[PDB]
Sequence to fold (276 residues):
Amino acid sequence: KCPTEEICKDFSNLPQCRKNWLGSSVKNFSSDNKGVLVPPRRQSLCLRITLQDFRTKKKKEGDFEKFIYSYASSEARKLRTIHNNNLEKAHQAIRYSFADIGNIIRGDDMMDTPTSKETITYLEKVLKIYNENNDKPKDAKKWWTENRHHVWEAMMCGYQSAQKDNQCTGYGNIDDIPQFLRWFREWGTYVCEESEKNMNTLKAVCFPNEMCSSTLKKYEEWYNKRKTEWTEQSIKYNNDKINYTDIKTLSPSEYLIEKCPECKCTKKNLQDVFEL
Ligand SMILES: [Zn+2]
Ligand SMILES: [Zn+2]
Ligand SMILES: [Zn+2]
Ligand SMILES: [Zn+2]
Fold:
Protein backbone atom coordinates (compact mmCIF):
# COMPACT_ATOMS: atom_id res chain seq x y z
CA LYS A 1 0.00 0.00 0.00
CA CYS A 2 0.90 3.66 0.33
CA PRO A 3 3.00 4.64 3.37
CA THR A 4 1.23 5.82 6.55
CA GLU A 5 0.26 9.47 6.85
CA GLU A 6 2.80 9.79 9.64
CA ILE A 7 5.78 8.78 7.48
CA CYS A 8 4.69 11.23 4.78
CA LYS A 9 4.59 14.15 7.24
CA ASP A 10 8.32 13.65 7.81
CA PHE A 11 8.90 14.55 4.14
CA SER A 12 8.64 18.04 2.64
CA ASN A 13 8.28 19.54 -0.84
CA LEU A 14 10.76 21.83 -2.59
CA PRO A 15 9.53 24.64 -4.89
CA GLN A 16 12.74 24.15 -6.91
CA CYS A 17 10.99 21.32 -8.72
CA ARG A 18 8.70 22.54 -11.50
CA LYS A 19 7.37 20.83 -14.63
CA ASN A 20 14.20 15.65 -26.54
CA TRP A 21 16.50 12.59 -26.46
CA LEU A 22 20.00 14.01 -26.04
CA GLY A 23 23.14 12.43 -27.49
CA SER A 24 25.54 14.65 -25.58
CA SER A 25 26.11 15.73 -21.97
CA VAL A 26 26.80 12.05 -21.24
CA LYS A 27 30.13 11.05 -19.61
CA ASN A 28 32.46 9.44 -22.18
CA PHE A 29 29.85 9.80 -24.93
CA SER A 30 32.58 9.01 -27.49
CA SER A 31 33.94 5.90 -25.75
CA ASP A 32 32.30 3.87 -22.95
CA ASN A 33 28.89 5.44 -23.55
CA LYS A 34 28.77 5.87 -27.32
CA GLY A 35 25.15 5.52 -28.32
CA VAL A 36 23.63 6.57 -25.00
CA LEU A 37 20.70 8.97 -25.20
CA VAL A 38 19.53 10.71 -22.02
CA PRO A 39 15.79 10.55 -21.38
CA PRO A 40 14.02 13.96 -21.19
CA ARG A 41 12.71 12.91 -17.75
CA ARG A 42 16.30 12.39 -16.59
CA GLN A 43 17.48 15.72 -18.08
CA SER A 44 14.75 17.32 -16.03
CA LEU A 45 15.12 15.21 -12.86
CA CYS A 46 14.66 17.27 -9.69
CA LEU A 47 17.79 16.73 -7.59
CA ARG A 48 20.64 19.15 -7.09
CA ILE A 49 23.10 19.27 -4.22
CA THR A 50 25.59 22.09 -4.14
CA LEU A 51 28.63 22.70 -1.95
CA GLN A 52 26.44 25.23 -0.20
CA ASP A 53 23.66 22.65 0.46
CA PHE A 54 26.33 20.46 2.00
CA ARG A 55 27.47 23.33 4.25
CA THR A 56 24.02 24.08 5.62
CA LYS A 57 22.52 20.58 5.93
CA LYS A 58 25.61 18.93 7.48
CA LYS A 59 25.13 21.01 10.67
CA LYS A 60 22.21 18.89 11.91
CA GLU A 61 22.27 15.07 11.85
CA GLY A 62 19.81 13.68 9.32
CA ASP A 63 19.12 16.97 7.52
CA PHE A 64 21.21 16.15 4.45
CA GLU A 65 19.42 12.82 4.07
CA LYS A 66 16.04 14.53 4.48
CA PHE A 67 17.08 17.03 1.80
CA ILE A 68 17.54 14.11 -0.57
CA TYR A 69 14.17 12.62 0.49
CA SER A 70 12.50 15.99 -0.12
CA TYR A 71 13.87 16.19 -3.67
CA ALA A 72 12.72 12.63 -4.40
CA SER A 73 9.28 13.48 -3.06
CA SER A 74 9.07 16.60 -5.22
CA GLU A 75 10.25 14.71 -8.31
CA ALA A 76 7.44 12.22 -7.75
CA ARG A 77 4.80 14.88 -7.18
CA LYS A 78 5.94 16.64 -10.36
CA LEU A 79 5.77 13.44 -12.42
CA ARG A 80 2.23 12.69 -11.35
CA THR A 81 1.26 16.30 -12.06
CA ILE A 82 2.66 15.84 -15.59
CA HIS A 83 1.01 12.44 -16.09
CA ASN A 84 -2.19 13.31 -14.20
CA ASN A 85 -4.61 11.41 -16.47
CA ASN A 86 -2.52 8.27 -16.65
CA LEU A 87 -1.74 6.40 -13.47
CA GLU A 88 0.59 3.81 -15.01
CA LYS A 89 2.76 6.17 -17.04
CA ALA A 90 3.08 8.13 -13.80
CA HIS A 91 4.06 5.00 -11.88
CA GLN A 92 6.65 3.97 -14.42
CA ALA A 93 8.16 7.47 -14.62
CA ILE A 94 8.46 7.49 -10.79
CA ARG A 95 10.22 4.12 -10.91
CA TYR A 96 12.65 5.36 -13.57
CA SER A 97 13.45 8.49 -11.52
CA PHE A 98 13.85 6.41 -8.38
CA ALA A 99 16.45 4.28 -10.14
CA ASP A 100 18.14 7.38 -11.50
CA ILE A 101 18.34 8.88 -7.98
CA GLY A 102 20.06 5.62 -7.02
CA ASN A 103 22.83 5.95 -9.63
CA ILE A 104 23.35 9.63 -8.75
CA ILE A 105 23.72 8.87 -5.01
CA ARG A 106 25.96 5.92 -5.81
CA GLY A 107 28.13 8.04 -8.07
CA ASP A 108 27.69 6.20 -11.36
CA ASP A 109 24.96 8.16 -13.13
CA MET A 110 25.87 8.77 -16.83
CA MET A 111 24.95 12.47 -17.08
CA ASP A 112 27.91 14.81 -17.02
CA THR A 113 26.72 17.36 -14.44
CA PRO A 114 27.87 18.64 -11.05
CA THR A 115 25.00 16.90 -9.24
CA SER A 116 25.90 13.57 -10.78
CA LYS A 117 29.58 14.00 -10.03
CA GLU A 118 29.37 15.66 -6.58
CA THR A 119 26.37 14.15 -4.71
CA ILE A 120 28.28 11.03 -3.74
CA THR A 121 31.18 13.10 -2.37
CA TYR A 122 28.88 15.26 -0.20
CA LEU A 123 26.84 12.33 1.16
CA GLU A 124 29.91 10.32 2.08
CA LYS A 125 31.57 13.23 3.88
CA VAL A 126 28.39 13.75 5.96
CA LEU A 127 28.28 10.01 6.77
CA LYS A 128 31.93 10.12 7.88
CA ILE A 129 31.05 12.95 10.25
CA TYR A 130 28.07 11.25 11.90
CA ASN A 131 28.73 7.52 11.50
CA GLU A 132 32.47 7.06 11.98
CA ASN A 133 32.12 5.50 15.43
CA ASN A 134 28.87 3.57 15.05
CA ASP A 135 27.71 0.77 12.72
CA LYS A 136 25.86 3.02 10.26
CA PRO A 137 26.81 3.38 6.55
CA LYS A 138 30.00 5.24 5.66
CA ASP A 139 29.79 4.76 1.90
CA ALA A 140 27.03 5.63 -0.56
CA LYS A 141 26.55 2.08 -1.83
CA LYS A 142 25.66 0.74 1.61
CA TRP A 143 23.63 3.89 2.32
CA TRP A 144 21.49 3.25 -0.78
CA THR A 145 20.89 -0.41 0.18
CA GLU A 146 19.83 0.61 3.68
CA ASN A 147 17.82 3.69 2.73
CA ARG A 148 16.35 3.05 -0.71
CA HIS A 149 13.13 1.94 0.99
CA HIS A 150 12.88 5.36 2.66
CA VAL A 151 13.60 7.07 -0.66
CA TRP A 152 10.76 5.13 -2.24
CA GLU A 153 8.36 6.02 0.58
CA ALA A 154 9.18 9.73 0.02
CA MET A 155 8.35 9.26 -3.66
CA MET A 156 5.03 7.61 -2.86
CA CYS A 157 4.22 10.35 -0.34
CA GLY A 158 5.13 12.78 -3.10
CA TYR A 159 2.99 11.00 -5.69
CA GLN A 160 -0.02 11.02 -3.34
CA SER A 161 0.18 14.79 -2.70
CA ALA A 162 -0.34 15.52 -6.42
CA GLN A 163 -4.02 14.50 -6.41
CA LYS A 164 -4.62 12.37 -3.29
CA ASP A 165 -4.10 9.08 -5.12
CA ASN A 166 -4.60 6.02 -2.93
CA GLN A 167 -2.98 3.67 -5.44
CA CYS A 168 0.72 3.32 -4.66
CA THR A 169 3.08 0.63 -5.95
CA GLY A 170 6.43 -1.01 -5.34
CA TYR A 171 9.47 -0.34 -7.49
CA GLY A 172 10.14 -3.91 -8.54
CA ASN A 173 13.89 -4.22 -8.78
CA ILE A 174 14.14 -1.20 -11.07
CA ASP A 175 17.17 0.31 -9.30
CA ASP A 176 19.19 -2.88 -9.92
CA ILE A 177 18.75 -2.75 -13.70
CA PRO A 178 21.80 -1.20 -15.39
CA GLN A 179 21.06 2.44 -16.18
CA PHE A 180 21.71 2.27 -19.95
CA LEU A 181 19.19 -0.57 -20.17
CA ARG A 182 16.56 1.41 -18.24
CA TRP A 183 16.99 4.40 -20.54
CA PHE A 184 16.78 2.15 -23.59
CA ARG A 185 13.56 0.62 -22.14
CA GLU A 186 12.04 4.04 -21.44
CA TRP A 187 12.80 5.03 -25.03
CA GLY A 188 11.09 1.76 -25.91
CA THR A 189 7.94 2.65 -23.95
CA TYR A 190 7.56 5.94 -25.82
CA VAL A 191 8.47 4.67 -29.27
CA CYS A 192 6.56 1.38 -29.44
CA GLU A 193 3.51 3.38 -28.36
CA GLU A 194 4.09 5.94 -31.11
CA SER A 195 4.71 3.11 -33.56
CA GLU A 196 1.45 1.30 -32.83
CA LYS A 197 -0.53 4.53 -33.00
CA ASN A 198 1.17 5.76 -36.16
CA MET A 199 0.61 2.45 -37.95
CA ASN A 200 -3.11 2.38 -37.17
CA THR A 201 -3.32 5.95 -38.39
CA LEU A 202 -1.40 5.14 -41.57
CA LYS A 203 -3.42 2.01 -42.40
CA ALA A 204 -6.73 3.74 -41.60
CA VAL A 205 -6.00 6.71 -43.85
CA CYS A 206 -4.16 4.91 -46.63
CA PHE A 207 -5.86 1.51 -46.64
CA PRO A 208 -9.51 1.52 -45.44
CA ASN A 209 -5.83 10.64 -51.69
CA GLU A 210 -3.67 13.58 -50.66
CA MET A 211 -4.51 12.83 -47.03
CA CYS A 212 -2.86 9.44 -47.47
CA SER A 213 0.16 11.03 -49.09
CA SER A 214 0.28 13.66 -46.34
CA THR A 215 -0.07 11.00 -43.62
CA LEU A 216 2.71 8.89 -45.12
CA LYS A 217 5.05 11.89 -45.30
CA LYS A 218 4.59 12.53 -41.59
CA TYR A 219 4.90 8.81 -40.82
CA GLU A 220 8.25 8.91 -42.62
CA GLU A 221 9.50 11.89 -40.59
CA TRP A 222 8.55 10.16 -37.33
CA TYR A 223 10.29 7.00 -38.55
CA ASN A 224 13.55 8.70 -39.54
CA LYS A 225 13.74 10.58 -36.22
CA ARG A 226 13.33 7.44 -34.13
CA LYS A 227 15.43 5.31 -36.52
CA THR A 228 18.55 7.41 -35.80
CA GLU A 229 17.92 6.99 -32.09
CA TRP A 230 17.39 3.27 -32.52
CA THR A 231 20.68 3.07 -34.37
CA GLU A 232 22.58 5.02 -31.70
CA GLN A 233 21.17 3.08 -28.76
CA SER A 234 21.81 -0.28 -30.46
CA ILE A 235 25.52 0.60 -30.53
CA LYS A 236 25.67 0.87 -26.74
CA TYR A 237 23.38 -2.15 -26.28
CA ASN A 238 25.49 -4.39 -28.52
CA ASN A 239 28.81 -3.27 -27.05
CA ASP A 240 27.72 -3.91 -23.47
CA LYS A 241 25.43 -6.96 -23.66
CA ILE A 242 28.46 -9.30 -23.65
CA ASN A 243 28.77 -8.73 -19.91
CA TYR A 244 25.28 -10.02 -19.02
CA THR A 245 24.79 -13.75 -19.32
CA ASP A 246 21.04 -13.56 -19.90
CA ILE A 247 20.95 -10.99 -22.71
CA LYS A 248 24.32 -11.53 -24.48
CA THR A 249 22.70 -13.45 -27.36
CA LEU A 250 19.72 -11.10 -27.66
CA SER A 251 19.44 -8.38 -30.31
CA PRO A 252 18.27 -4.92 -29.23
CA SER A 253 14.78 -5.65 -30.56
CA GLU A 254 14.62 -9.02 -28.77
CA TYR A 255 15.63 -7.28 -25.57
CA LEU A 256 12.77 -4.79 -25.74
CA ILE A 257 10.31 -7.39 -26.99
CA GLU A 258 11.05 -10.15 -24.49
CA LYS A 259 12.57 -8.38 -21.49
CA CYS A 260 10.70 -5.14 -21.08
CA PRO A 261 7.30 -5.79 -19.42
CA GLU A 262 6.49 -2.08 -19.29
CA CYS A 263 7.34 -1.55 -23.02
CA LYS A 264 4.51 -2.95 -25.17
CA CYS A 265 7.01 -3.53 -27.96
CA THR A 266 6.13 -6.20 -30.51
CA LYS A 267 7.59 -7.81 -33.62
CA LYS A 268 5.13 -5.74 -35.68
CA ASN A 269 5.59 -2.34 -34.01
CA LEU A 270 9.34 -2.50 -33.30
CA GLN A 271 11.18 -5.29 -35.05
CA ASP A 272 9.39 -5.05 -38.40
CA VAL A 273 9.66 -1.26 -38.35
CA PHE A 274 13.18 -0.57 -37.17
CA GLU A 275 15.22 -3.67 -38.02
CA LEU A 276 14.63 -4.45 -41.72
ZN1 LIG B 1 1.24 0.97 -11.27
ZN1 LIG C 1 6.64 10.84 -19.22
ZN1 LIG D 1 33.02 16.16 -18.48
ZN1 LIG E 1 11.05 4.79 5.91
